[PDB]
Point group: C2
Amino acid sequence: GAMELSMQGQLKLGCIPTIAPFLLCDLVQEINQRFPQLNLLLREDTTTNLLTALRHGELDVLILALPVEIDGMESRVVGQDPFKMVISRHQAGAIKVPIKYDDLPDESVFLLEKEHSLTEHAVSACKLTDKEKINPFSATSLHTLVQMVANGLGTTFIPQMAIDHGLLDNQNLVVIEPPGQQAYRDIGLVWRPSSSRSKTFNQLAEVVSELL
Amino acid sequence: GAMELSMQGQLKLGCIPTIAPFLLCDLVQEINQRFPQLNLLLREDTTTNLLTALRHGELDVLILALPVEIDGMESRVVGQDPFKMVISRHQAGAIKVPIKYDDLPDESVFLLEKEHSLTEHAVSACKLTDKEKINPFSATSLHTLVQMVANGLGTTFIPQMAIDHGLLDNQNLVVIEPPGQQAYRDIGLVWRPSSSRSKTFNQLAEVVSELL
């Protein structure tokens, strides 16, 4: 017979669509080795939907792009994810590099719709103030946005983590720097101040910081 | 001076999340060469949302997984996309191959929520009738589903086109055949019978059929 005997157990983690396909692959491989008893249940959803689930205790922690409105939650920024622009190789002549927005054709910049934090962050960080350059047809996923650019329709902003995870493979695209300063989005972890798992969240934040 | 002078022009195409990231990359490269004056505006959305947009004339044509309820629309099946199962390499011992569902642990099969056609198609085609094997935590994207499997939490069904497009890269997964017969989902194009663009849709269907 036999005697009866913080990174252990289960965590529900939410993440936005322009981070989840890229960073979480790396996170899972790292936790598999470093914290092998941590089971990560995952939810992918829009920022607003994730925040409601977090408030309601249906998720334990989120990985978001910041800043977004998160009053009342606790957050920790863990790294920065640069922005690049992309154009098709076939269009690399009709678009001059360095990019100057005023020299692009009207309606040549394609962006995700507003439920997506990528648009507010890229437009502000990359200083796109001329609304006439934005195409009126809004994209609904980062993959289909990049495919429209690959079809030669114009240009857009892409996060570095997507490039590093092969999003552009086999689509014959060229990666360019956005005009002006080096531009980026902050990545952070967000959780409830009342949570009893903040030791877990801070260890997780250290792990994620090493992947960015 | 100078004198005043069907796969040309613009097409709005909708596609579901478990097809769009994979097949449309190949489609865009093929049309760039074969139909260089065709501009493909793309929308990614759930089956029901895409059908409403198609009815309402906000999209011209859809690429869907079939069968789904499409009364009143015209459709053409263009190919078949096999299903596989995946497990983590680290779990390849605790799960025996060939897979027999009755021998899996209860709650070991993770599936997308019901807005996703992947779940109804994989469960029916792969003959999963024992509901006790299905984990009660539903996934909300194919990438995060695969990441939970990569974390060692259980198994799931994946379409071949995702594997062929690298979804499993660097996640240390093993690809297995689902039990029983070879199982697959039909892929098809769907459009309005009143459309004046059916010549375009049939040429597009030929192109897509060659990618599957």
